[model samples]
Target: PEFMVTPALADLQEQLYNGNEKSQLAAMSTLSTAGTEGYHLLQEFLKDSATFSPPPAPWIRGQAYRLLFHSPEASVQAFLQQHYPQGVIPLRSDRGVDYQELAKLFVAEKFEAADRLTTQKLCELAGPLAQKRRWLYFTEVEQLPIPDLQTIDQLWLAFSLGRFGYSVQRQLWLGCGQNWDRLWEKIGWRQGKRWPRYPNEFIWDLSAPRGHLPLTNQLRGVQVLNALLNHPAWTA
Candidate 1:
């Protein structure tokens, strides 16, 4: 049967295409209630929005896909498997690394696993030596490709709704006048001279403070993190 473009669907379509971010989110949420018609509208939105010259924010696409990814409809599931087999957020990497797992972890809200994988990926990006060592050297951080860093950052930002990621950390660090002491305190990484223990003290969910994820290792010194934040990736 052909779908009708009811007034409600038309208004939601307008908001999905022309309204601000909040409005678009509301429209998307409301559209989810409209069953197959909503699914079609969302499918069309994803198709059109994906090709925008200056593409919509990664979270927009990520969230849109999340809505449809869990649909009970077999056609919707088939469409997703055909169109986005590896999931959304575009696992881009200049050095030929695959970020599909990272995107999946974030999509699943498995933040702790995602964070560990992110560290592993960064090490791999730094080169075989760093990979073997299982940690990044301050100088090695500079060798990481801009696209990979951006992809990782975008995943964190998109999944957390702009609340986490290296960029978010950098912004906070800059706001603290580039002071590590203040930055750590602000992000719950430190309290006075005491650093929080790993795997337990750290927050793995969105409830953590901004820039509170994808933890940078500060075991040796601040140079590695310094190199990461100073990397030209954010500017590009």
Candidate 2:
């Protein structure tokens, strides 16, 4: 479904700068396919309501996230600086994204999307969606959007384990040496406690080999963490 990306800067900026409803939407769509150039254009979107605010939706924002992930750290940081718009907040795919704003955004983005957070649906979504949703919790804890690993702890781990599809192989293993050790240290490992576990159901099968899981198709937490761990941008 993905075509070769076409880079359009001037045309997209023109469409965005025209300052009409129709033009705004046109600009968003155009930039959606604009690839690298489009991301660069959106670099200024977060700050200027004249261009984009309350942004297109989590769908657009999510694509922007993935694109930013691979684009360049400098650009990604700039987008965050300008928009201050957070990433596509994850919700239980099957259940619902609990945030009123994000739920509204989802429904608005996909008119057909039902605004209901159900246990069944949350259980059905793959791990990445679940994990990302859990990550969104950091915003609540720190009162801002930060994705640092230190914040996510053992109870959340257990919660993710129980709530997630639970079908991924080696679902509780990870390669984060002391980080993993510290998570247990900071968050006491209470056996069989279930509070704060229901709202989420994701886990990291750290022992499993690194790769995409085909079933439930949830993101493999370990794999993703590994990718983030050694991404050249951070190292550089």
Candidate 3:
């Protein structure tokens, strides 16, 4: 089929390559049209950071990370590190540890913590790490064992875990949390008074329909951001 590359497509691709962050981000968002075809192309674009230019403003960097998150594979982090050579939250905001790298370490350590948790206590210990908002990795951790999660949780976990950056996963988790009313009912969890306004929706539903973006993904993301703000947990 020769992959069907049109002159228009070529021009757009060129524009995307040399474009400002806005144009490139536009290309990325629209590329979803290509369906499976776009995945490989987006992945290729992400691999070559030099081809794209971030907006002059700092706020634009956040959008750039987002576009990368949606169409990215696990390997995109390498380019991310290369592009932002200085790295996120530089020097642990002062001390030394690269905050992004530290969050990665914290994720690993928490998984280790989960390793020791019997199914009975999995929810308690992980509640904090998975619900966190600081450091890197989106404060949105997942269950080490996918099978441990129930139905709706399983669907959410499957797609959320597939995301390249833990930041991406965190976004999805935040989305679910904000829509806990819907998620909790579907996931079949016990509820309490006050409902926390933003009741925790991390409960696993053993029997429920499963699919990504089940009215919850976007809701939680809309409610609150999942990235580190000023202070992150797991220190010293």
Candidate 4:
């Protein structure tokens, strides 16, 4: 799917770099089509564009944020509220916000209330195919595209304040000698010999061990866990 997505992004990149007014504004729309990856990349482009020689076209920089401000994310909404109470406006030159970190916060707020948000919903936010599947495949999970993995991991890590993510889980998994039973025990997903049931049985609060909220049990066990733990995202 990235094979399809990457070229579109490249075309948008070119438009952002060299296109005229209408085409540049259109580039932001194309970026939005990529979902969160597009959202973040738009941020990167905005930053890089502004820093370059002679500075990026003010029109693109201003229009990009204008488009981003229209997004439904609460974190972005809050930032806009704080800075531009009247409405979204072009950020004046010399003022800045950490869009990536703000993105993490936006994602974190989505999962902060894990009790109401199901893993199914989590997967939807992670990728388009997962959204349609209503579940994820371990084979596919093992090879989650880097952007999707980072999006998932960023949400979890932000919500948990750096206490969770695939990387953290990989570390915990390694510590248990690659043993799931012990790993589950270490993470409080299991008690005694019993694995918890969904919703009611699981601990949704921060009280649970890090990397514990977004349970990987959807793939049903070892292979999925192995796939996820060994996935390239962790090492990256």
| Candidate maximizing lDDT | 1
Q: Find the 10 residues in a row with the least total lDDT in model 4.
A: 89-98
lDDT of 4 by residue, 87-190 (tens): 22221211121224334333334444442334554354446777676666677666555555555555455445445666678888888898876778778787
Regions of candidate 4 where Cα sits further than 4 Å from its true position: 1-118, 121-133
Candidate 2 lDDT by residue in tens digits, 1-236: 11122333666665554445456556756665666567666554422433454434323333334344445557666655464443334333222323334333332332112212222223223245544564322123222112221111111222222221112122332333435333322232212443123213312332322221111211323333333323232222
Model 1: per-residue Cα lDDT at residue 203: 90
Total clashing residue pairs per candidate? 0, 19, 2, 0
My TM-score estimates for the predictions, one after another, are 0.89, 0.28, 0.29, 0.50
Residue pairs clashing in model 4 are none
Give one digit per residue, the lDDT tens place, for model 3 in 1-236: 21235343565555455666567657656664555445445545544543334423221233334344444455554655666443221121211212333223222323222212222222232455432522113233232222222211222232222222222233444567646455434333224632222224432221323321122233344332222211122110
Against the true structure, whose TM-score is highest?
1
Select the stronger candidate by lDDT from 2 and 4: 4
Candidate 4 lDDT at 72 equals: 69
Task: Go through the candidates in order and give the C-alpha RMSD of each one to the true structure.
Answer: 2.9, 17.7, 13.4, 15.9
C-alpha positional error of residue 132 in candidate 2 after TM-score superposition, expressed in Å: 27
Using lDDT as the measure, name the better of candidate 3 and candidate 4. Answer: 4
* Candidate number with the higher TM-score (1 or 4): 1
**Candidate number that wins on TM-score, 2 or 4:** 4
